[PDB]
Scaffold this active site. Structure first.
Site, PDB file in Angstrom:
ATOM      1  N   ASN A  85       1.348  -3.083   4.539  1.00  0.00           N
ATOM      2  CA  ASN A  85       2.489  -2.271   4.167  1.00  0.00           C
ATOM      3  C   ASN A  85       2.462  -2.265   2.641  1.00  0.00           C
ATOM      4  OD1 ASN A  85       6.121  -2.347   4.844  1.00  0.00           O
ATOM      5  ND2 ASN A  85       4.834  -0.919   3.690  1.00  0.00           N
ATOM      6  N   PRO A  86       2.019  -1.153   2.043  1.00  0.00           N
ATOM      7  CA  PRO A  86       1.957  -1.065   0.586  1.00  0.00           C
ATOM      8  C   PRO A  86       3.334  -0.755   0.013  1.00  0.00           C
ATOM      9  CG  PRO A  86       1.454   1.040   1.459  1.00  0.00           C
ATOM     10  CD  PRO A  86       1.593   0.114   2.664  1.00  0.00           C
ATOM     11  N   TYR A  88       6.230   1.142  -1.784  1.00  0.00           N
ATOM     12  CA  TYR A  88       6.533   2.562  -1.903  1.00  0.00           C
ATOM     13  C   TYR A  88       7.206   2.731  -3.261  1.00  0.00           C
ATOM     14  CZ  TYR A  88       6.503   1.948   3.254  1.00  0.00           C
ATOM     15  OH  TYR A  88       6.203   1.638   4.558  1.00  0.00           O
ATOM     16  N   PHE A 165      12.960   1.240   9.628  1.00  0.00           N
ATOM     17  CA  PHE A 165      13.326   0.135   8.745  1.00  0.00           C
ATOM     18  C   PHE A 165      14.842   0.036   8.725  1.00  0.00           C
ATOM     19  CE2 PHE A 165       9.426   1.974   6.733  1.00  0.00           C
ATOM     20  CZ  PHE A 165       8.570   0.923   7.071  1.00  0.00           C
TER      21      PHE A 165
HETATM   22  N1  LIG Z   1      -0.181  -3.607  -7.622  1.00  0.00           N
HETATM   23  C1  LIG Z   1      -0.053  -4.622  -6.755  1.00  0.00           C
HETATM   24  N2  LIG Z   1      -1.126  -5.384  -6.443  1.00  0.00           N
HETATM   25  C2  LIG Z   1      -0.971  -6.418  -5.610  1.00  0.00           C
HETATM   26  N3  LIG Z   1       0.128  -6.847  -5.000  1.00  0.00           N
HETATM   27  C3  LIG Z   1       1.176  -6.061  -5.327  1.00  0.00           C
HETATM   28  C4  LIG Z   1       1.170  -4.969  -6.168  1.00  0.00           C
HETATM   29  N4  LIG Z   1       2.439  -4.397  -6.240  1.00  0.00           N
HETATM   30  C5  LIG Z   1       3.124  -5.156  -5.458  1.00  0.00           C
HETATM   31  N5  LIG Z   1       2.470  -6.179  -4.863  1.00  0.00           N
HETATM   32  C6  LIG Z   1       2.984  -7.209  -3.958  1.00  0.00           C
HETATM   33  O1  LIG Z   1       3.173  -6.680  -2.626  1.00  0.00           O
HETATM   34  C7  LIG Z   1       4.461  -7.104  -2.112  1.00  0.00           C
HETATM   35  C8  LIG Z   1       5.344  -5.889  -1.838  1.00  0.00           C
HETATM   36  S1  LIG Z   1       5.245  -5.290  -0.143  1.00  0.00           S
HETATM   37  C9  LIG Z   1       5.984  -3.645   0.034  1.00  0.00           C
HETATM   38  C10 LIG Z   1       7.091  -3.560   1.085  1.00  0.00           C
HETATM   39  C11 LIG Z   1       7.745  -2.174   1.267  1.00  0.00           C
HETATM   40  N6  LIG Z   1       6.767  -1.198   1.733  1.00  0.00           N
HETATM   41  C12 LIG Z   1       8.412  -1.707  -0.025  1.00  0.00           C
HETATM   42  O2  LIG Z   1       8.306  -0.503  -0.341  1.00  0.00           O
HETATM   43  O3  LIG Z   1       9.034  -2.541  -0.711  1.00  0.00           O
HETATM   44  C13 LIG Z   1       5.089  -8.006  -3.164  1.00  0.00           C
HETATM   45  O4  LIG Z   1       4.903  -9.383  -2.801  1.00  0.00           O
HETATM   46  C14 LIG Z   1       4.328  -7.710  -4.427  1.00  0.00           C
HETATM   47  O5  LIG Z   1       4.189  -8.887  -5.223  1.00  0.00           O
END
Ligand SMILES: Nc1ncnc2c1ncn2[C@@H]1O[C@H](CSCC[C@H](N)C(=O)O)[C@@H](O)[C@H]1O
Length: 382
Positions: A85-86, A88, A165
């Protein structure tokens, strides 16, 4: 947005990888997908997780943790399966850098788009990717380059989940992509006690990146038995408040010879409320054409602030507007306003727009508007 357990379950069952294959989770935190996959598919794989925040990186012993900016990470290795889940959202220089780095980057774009392009590039041939992302990329033009990229790099499967969600303004979609070029498959989904059950909706083997819609027999019948709105009209945009505020003659208290600058709340289905002022700006009607010429000509108004539905009215008095879509007929086009309007606001037109675009985006967009079918006897080009 947090990932519900049943959604995670659904994605893990769409995931497959060879024994000994590398499994990666971008932006892992404590590795929720690495954990779920291992429990359902076994321990015979290499697990990696990439996290940028050392305070967030919390992976079990069997997994390899990488502290880095996934978007700028170059492993020198390719993976068999990528899931997650990247984040957003939008974000200068870390951005600018990104722009240089990503070819599908267009307009404001969105981090989830960059994660997608990046993930597809770290995939071994025939590798698969399973991600939960917003549904906006299906219709928005900022994502037109992304759709093409995906269309030419492999086969794409899109599963509609919706607003799953706890935060309700986001409609989600699960994309399963395999690096073996072969069209697009659109799937619907059924929610129950067990979790989700997919239902194949349609297949587009010749997909080249066109907008994705939930088509039916009836939506097709409707579109071929009429002319698209965009062929009969010019779609213009209104001026904003700053433009109005920088215009002498524009006042802030009512007065003789001053009309209110109309907004979306003045627009009703089938008519305009010229009474209420919702902008707090006023100006002499006759000087409106100085901001936009079409302000001086009675025309059709369709809303973009009222969601994914068609609300239309004919501005018979020609007042100044601060928003919405403004349609001016193309030369040679002759139409019947009263019936055109009745048609646009019809219960048939709403079901049409609802079936095709569901809740992908929060408001009607230019691309959706210009393809609306105008039934032959309302307007024609002579
Ligand atoms: N550029 C990047 N590279 C690696 N990890 C990253 C990142 N940007 C965020 N993260 C990590 O990925 C996690 C976020 S997960 C995203 C959840 C949801 N889809 C939302 O929109 O919020 C966090 O723990 C953050 O530290």
């Amino acid at each position: 947005v947090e990932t519900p357990p049943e959604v995670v379950d659904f994605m893990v069952s769409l995931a497959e990888a060879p024994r000994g294959g590398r499994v990666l989770e971008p932006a892992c935190a404590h590795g929720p997908f690495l954990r779920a996959f291992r429990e359902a598919h076994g321990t015979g794989y290499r697990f990696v997780g990439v996290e940028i925040d050392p305070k967030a990186l919390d992976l079990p012993p069997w997994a390899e943790g990488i502290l880095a900016d996934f978007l700028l990470w170059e492993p020198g290795e390719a993976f068999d399966l990528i899931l997650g889940n990247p984040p957003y959202g939008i974000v200068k220089a870390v951005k600018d850098l990104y722009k240089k780095a990503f070819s599908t980057w267009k307009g404001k774009y969105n981090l989830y788009g960059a994660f997608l392009e990046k993930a597809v590039r770290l995939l071994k041939p025939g590798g698969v990717l399973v991600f939960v992302v917003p549904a906006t990329w299906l219709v928005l033009e900022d994502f037109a380059l992304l759709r093409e990229f995906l269309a030419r790099e492999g086969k794409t499967s899109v599963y509609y989940l919706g607003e799953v969600f706890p935060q309700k303004k986001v409609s989600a979609v699960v994309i399963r992509f395999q690096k073996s070029g072969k069209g697009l498959s659109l799937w619907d989904t059924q929610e129950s006690e067990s979790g989700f059950t997919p239902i194949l909706w349609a297949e587009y083997p010749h997909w080249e990146g066109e907008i994705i819609r939930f088509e039916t027999e009836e939506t097709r019948k409707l579109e071929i038995s009429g002319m698209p709105l965009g062929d009969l009209f010019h779609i213009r945009f209104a001026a904003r408040s700053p433009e109005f505020k920088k215009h002498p003659a524009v006042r802030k208290e009512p007065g003789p010879g001053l009309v209110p600058v109309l907004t979306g709340r003045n627009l009703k289905p089938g008519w305009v409320d010229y009474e209420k002022n919702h902008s707090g700006l006023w100006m002499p009607k006759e000087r409106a054409k100085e901001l936009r010429d079409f302000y001086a000509t009675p025309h059709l108004v369709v809303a973009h602030t009222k969601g994914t539905r068609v609300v239309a009215a004919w501005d018979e008095r020609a007042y100044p507007w601060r928003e919405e879509f403004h349609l001016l007929p193309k030369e040679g086009v002759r139409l019947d306003p009263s019936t055109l309007v009745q048609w646009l606001n019809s219960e048939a037109m709403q079901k049409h727009v609802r079936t095709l675009y569901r809740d992908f985006v929060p408001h009607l967009t230019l691309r959706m508007l210009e393809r609306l079918p105008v039934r032959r006897e309302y307007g024609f080009h002579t």
